[PDB]
Amino acid sequence: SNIEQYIHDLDSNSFELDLQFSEDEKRLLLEKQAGGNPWHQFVENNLILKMGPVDERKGLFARRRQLLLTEGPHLYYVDPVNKVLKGEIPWSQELRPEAKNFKTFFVHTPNRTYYLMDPSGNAHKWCRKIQEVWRQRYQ
């Protein structure tokens, strides 16, 4: 199955998937997630395509999230300390990621632009992956 061929784990909490797997491979990837991923409970049984820590600039100080791009598509954000789903960035054809620098990226949606910061310096990886999924979904 060599299913690991599609998984690129940086560490416990950051990975992304190559999106060129078959339906049988998808189901195997999902069983692996349910069996092994501590954030699976937050994503409504959707296969996680990319996850990792991101800070949202909101209110009086940045909120550290675990951000999860999934099948759906969905972008869920979870409190990584108290282990509670905090919300989702709403997905539509109008959703648009935009890199501002190596650490900062925005996710534009009709009623709100989410201002996000990747402390690892890989905001572009987030934009690229969100765009890849957007392209697959919207042509």
From Swiss-Prot:
Q: Which UniProt keywords apply?
A: Acetylation, Activator, ATP-binding, Cell junction, Cell membrane, Cytoplasm, Kinase, Membrane, Nucleotide-binding, Nucleus, Phosphoprotein, Serine/threonine-protein kinase, Transcription, Transcription regulation, Transferase, Ubl conjugation
The chain residues annotated with the modification Phosphoserine are 1, 92, 120
Subunit relationships: Homodimer in its autoinhibited state. Active as monomer. Interacts with NPRL2, PPARG, PAK1, PTK2B, GRB14, PKN1 (via C-terminus), STRAP and IKKB. Interacts with SGK3 in a phosphorylation-dependent manner. The tyrosine-phosphorylated form interacts with PTPN6. Binds INSR in response to insulin. Interacts (via PH domain) with SMAD3, SMAD4 and SMAD7.
Where is this protein found?
Cytoplasm; Nucleus; Cell membrane; Cell junction, Focal adhesion
Residue ranges constituting the PH domain according to the UniProt record: 50-139
Query: In the record, which positions carry Phosphothreonine?
Result: 104
Give from-to of the shown chain within the full protein. 410 to 548 of 556
Principal subcellular localisation of the protein: cytoplasm
Function according to Swiss-Prot or TrEMBL: Serine/threonine kinase which acts as a master kinase, phosphorylating and activating a subgroup of the AGC family of protein kinases. Its targets include: protein kinase B (PKB/AKT1, PKB/AKT2, PKB/AKT3), p70 ribosomal protein S6 kinase (RPS6KB1), p90 ribosomal protein S6 kinase (RPS6KA1, RPS6KA2 and RPS6KA3), cyclic AMP-dependent protein kinase (PRKACA), protein kinase C (PRKCD and PRKCZ), serum and glucocorticoid-inducible kinase (SGK1, SGK2 and SGK3), p21-activated kinase-1 (PAK1), TSSK3, protein kinase PKN (PKN1 and PKN2).
Organism name = Homo sapiens
Gene designation: PDPK1
Changes after translation: Autophosphorylation is inhibited by the apoptotic C-terminus cleavage product of PKN2. Angiotensin II stimulates the tyrosine phosphorylation of PDPK1 in vascular smooth muscle in a calcium- and SRC-dependent manner.
Q: What is its induction? A: Stimulated by insulin, and the oxidants hydrogen peroxide and peroxovanadate.
Q: Could you give the domain comment from the record? A: The PH domain plays a pivotal role in the localization and nuclear import of PDPK1 and is also essential for its homodimerization. The PIF-pocket is a small lobe in the catalytic domain required by the enzyme for the binding to the hydrophobic motif of its substrates. It is an allosteric regulatory site that can accommodate small compounds acting as allosteric inhibitors.
Q: Which family does it belong to?
A: Belongs to the protein kinase superfamily. AGC Ser/Thr protein kinase family. PDPK1 subfamily.
The protein depicted here goes by the name 3-phosphoinositide-dependent protein kinase 1
Where is it found, in Gene Ontology cellular component terms? cell projection; cytoplasm; cytoplasmic vesicle; cytosol; focal adhesion; nucleus; plasma membrane; postsynaptic density
GO:BP terms for this protein? actin cytoskeleton organization; calcium-mediated signaling; cell migration; cellular response to epidermal growth factor stimulus; cellular response to insulin stimulus; epidermal growth factor receptor signaling pathway; extrinsic apoptotic signaling pathway; hyperosmotic response
Q: Name one GO molecular function term.
A: phospholipase activator activity
- Tissue expression profile of the protein: Appears to be expressed ubiquitously.
